[PDB]
Structures are given as structure tokens and as C-alpha cells.
Design a protein around this ligand. Sequence first.
Ligand SMILES: [Hg+2]
Length: 294
Amino acid sequence: EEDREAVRREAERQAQAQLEKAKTKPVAFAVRTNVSYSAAHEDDVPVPGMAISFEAKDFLHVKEKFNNDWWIGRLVKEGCEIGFIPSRVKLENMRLQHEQRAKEFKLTPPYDVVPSMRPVVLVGPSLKGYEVTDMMQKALFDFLKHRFEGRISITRVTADISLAKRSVLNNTRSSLAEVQSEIERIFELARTLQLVVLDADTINHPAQLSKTSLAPIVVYVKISSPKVLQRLIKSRGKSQAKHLNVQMVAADKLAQCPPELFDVILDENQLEDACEHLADYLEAYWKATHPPSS
Ligand SMILES: [Hg+2]
């Protein structure tokens, strides 16, 4: 078992070399996992112990391809460095192997391409297009413009991106051609790993983007008390007091929406504190996608 380890030791040395250079290379593409994976019990791994494990719904940045079974990349989490990631074919084969084993007792798809930076989307306090909500979101946008100036892009999205259901695109106001055009734009904005914030007028609920391929960071601008909301709108004149109704319910709908559908929830009494809470979240997200050795 001496001459055998000869070839293996070298391949492992080469694999390591490629893994190292990849640390600074850019992100070819990002994926959201639909299944979990553990390298805990396997061989066939280029550099023993360098395979990355993940749970379903995790985000991965794929930098380059090693071979038909492994890609090189990292998990998007602070401190996580480059590592080997199983390829789609590899995961599918593992699915087959496990099924065979299951039958021997005689008792889809794993990755979704996603933008390299999760686009930030704001919903709440109520309906967009009006004022209470528009002004409060407009505030957060200006804050983010400065807090992350030089590393962020805030772009308006008129096209109804809520029509961008994976299945639909894989096959109404805006047209699919226009939507697809915007998704591409979103994807291309996050390419260089800069922070991407969207001002999507058609999105008031997280469910409108659940089936899409944007995997956004849904930010819930929540005003805890309904009374606070009511008063707030009233102080906008009859040009808003009339449209009052369509604002309380919309707000109440978000209020009943399960927190899981939200990534961040801004329910601070002071607007200055909402900003800082978001900045902190984005600052950590920024670190999860950037940091040391790149
Ligand atoms: Hg890792």
C-alpha cells in the first residue's frame, strides 16, 4: 500500500493547490440548497476533510469546478473558507446509492441557482405607492445609501418581479420577457458581491417572492401598534385618510404573516434604531459573503 499512496498523496497535493488559489477567485455563481449534505462519512473527497457540509436552505458560493463530482467554493457564513462542494451529479448519484441500499433491507433538484448577493426587499408598514410606507422605506434607503456607500446599489424595480416564479420562467401586468430581463439585471447587480437593495413597488408580502429565484432578504418594516399606524396615516391629510382602509388591512395581513417568511423585522419605536438594526444585519451578511483571504 506504498506505491498506491504515491499517486493519491500527489493528487491530494494538487487538489490542495487548486483549493488555495480559489480563495481569491471570484464567484462564478451562487446556489440555495434544497437538501442537506454531510461529508462526515466519505472518501472520494479531493482533499480529505475539506468537503463542506450544509443543511437544506443554505447558501453556497461556487467559485470553480474541480471535476464532475466536486466544485470548489464556500458556504456563505462568517469564518467559512473555501472547500469542496459536491456537484449536482454527485448528489444525485448519492441519492441513487441510498435508494439501492434501502431496497436491500428487504423490509430534486439539490441546488437552485440564486443571485450571489441576496437582494434586500422591504415590505411594510403598509402598502407601497402611498406615503406612510413610501416615506418610511425611502428613509431606510437613504440611510443604507450612506451607511454602505461605496459597497451598495439601490435600484428601483418597476417590473412585477412577483411573476418570476421559477416554474413560470422555466417555461398579468408586465410581460415575462420584461420580468426575465429584470431578474437578469438583479443577478448581474449582485455579481461583484456588492450589496443589492431593491425598491420593488409590487411587493408588499414575502409570499410574492417565495417561488421566485431571487431568494431575497425580506425586511419587514413593522410598526408594532395599529393605533400608531392609524394616527400616522391621518397626519397625511385627506389625500391619504381616504386610502386609509387599504392600509390597515394590508398592515394587519403582514402582522399575521409567520415571522419565518421574514429575514429581518424592524419593529423599533425610533426610526434611527430601525436603521441601526438593519445596518447590523447587513454588516454581518456582508462579512458572511466577503472576509479574510479574498
Ligand atoms: Hg466551510
